[model samples]
Target: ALSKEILEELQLNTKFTEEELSSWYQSFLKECPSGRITRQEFQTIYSKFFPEADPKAYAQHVFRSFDANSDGTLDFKEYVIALHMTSAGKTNQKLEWAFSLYDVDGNGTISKNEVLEIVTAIFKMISPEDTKHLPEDENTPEKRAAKIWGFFGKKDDDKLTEKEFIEGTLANKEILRLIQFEPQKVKEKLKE
Candidate 1:
């Protein structure tokens, strides 16, 4: 069981505070690292925190409930599948997605410059206007890119080895915290 202390520690490492972080941790505990929560539940929790978010679209992006093999509830594997899909978007389909986007050339790895290019692209695509409430500074994009690459790429390496970029970046504790706290926007769908 994750106590408030643990939640606080997680908060210190990430942006979420006690209540929001606690909710995520509690949900994880209930899901038992195996059980899966429904998209509706996810929406409810997410919207409560980030009221401006779009829950249904997010649900579609995260968990293509259509892919659920079972009739209803999602299992751990299914949930993870959704999470990966949501985080990486189309990049989840291939190991090279990260490399190709970050590599610039046909190179199999991601160089620092390549990482910068990819990050800049991402920043431009999802400009500060799109990411409400998130902080942005004069060098925010560059700083953010550097932080992301640093989490995955080592100093002066430039290119991120396949393992270093994918596994290391995705496995970051900070990333996990962000995912755990990502807000879901929900609104009642009008009946036809």
Candidate 2:
């Protein structure tokens, strides 16, 4: 059930056209007839999209981000918002959502351990075929997460607020490319 406030919020920040809104709602219902999806359901849904990869942990983090109400499920409106943010939303919108994904406790800040959690999930989600080209030493998830944190020039005890995460990611093209969902991937997704 999409509330009035959620509707207006989407109208403003999400900028989704009326047709897209209607279409996405229909598609959502098709996938989730109950109008809400649980975390386990989300993981199942994710597996279908990447059968060759293990999406369990990554799906859990993504489900946490999509559960805007923090009520342990994603209603249609929540699903739509996540879809827009990951698909066609602006760079800032996408990055803000990324921050939400990494901020595991909803404390409005992310630390090294939080970043490591997501990067590890990401590593598990990638298929072996996709990662085969990487060198031996830098191949593990811990090393990858550490490199990303090093890019921020912060101590392990430090944490990143929303502003710092957004600005810092934007300033560093490499890290920005790492976390940001590229529109190219969206295009490829459309084909699938």
Candidate 3:
């Protein structure tokens, strides 16, 4: 059974039902008996889920954003929060998480360099099979990041506020697709 507080917290912030949250908690504890995940453990899980991708860099970013308390380790609450936002949370919630991931230094604003850094890290995360389906123009990290930056109507020195980031991503489907980071595949692979 899940703790009442955690259940209530997830209920408020995520789409999971009471039963699902309990099941999730059970499985989470089975793997992480210590009830916490280290960065090494996270990268191991990432590699398990996406065996084809280079998981180190992107896993670091995901783990950092997921470590809500900046504690260098992930507690169950942080795990559930990141799991929700990365997998099935609403677009706004997902975008907010994405923003945090991109705002690497936690400065509350995203710079062009920040976008490129994260986008490149994400680009490296795609499997070879997935990359094969991408068109030549959108194939490289630079091209994709440049295209997303263009969609923002931003220039060299302009910073993207959380508001502008959300609205801009909402306004363009391609840009939305470009920046959307899915660690959701981990959810599927973890089901077994």
| Best model number under TM-score | 3
Worst 10 residues of 2 by lDDT: 182-191
Candidate 2 residue pairs in backbone clash: none
- Which segments of candidate 1 are over 4 A away from where they belong? 1-95, 136-139, 173-192
Off by over 4 Å in 3: 1-3, 13-27, 30-33, 89-92, 183-192
The candidate with the higher lDDT, 1 or 2, is 2
| Candidate 2 lDDT tens digits, 1-192 | 455676776775577666677777778789878888889987787688778767788778878888877889998777666556544646754676788888988998999999888877777655666566545655777887777888888798998788888888878876774554433352233234
RMSD of 2: 4.1
For model 3, how does the per-residue alpha-carbon lDDT over 34-112 read when each residue is reduced to its tens digit?
8888898877877887788887888888889878778789987777776566556556457767889999888899999
Ranking by TM-score: 3, 2, 1
Model 2 misplaced stretches (Cα beyond 4 Å) = 1-20, 23-33, 84-92, 135-137, 180-192
Error of 2 at 174 (Å): 1.3
Per-prediction count of colliding residue pairs?
Answer: 7, 0, 0
lDDT of each: 0.46, 0.72, 0.78
Among these predictions, the greatest lDDT belongs to 3
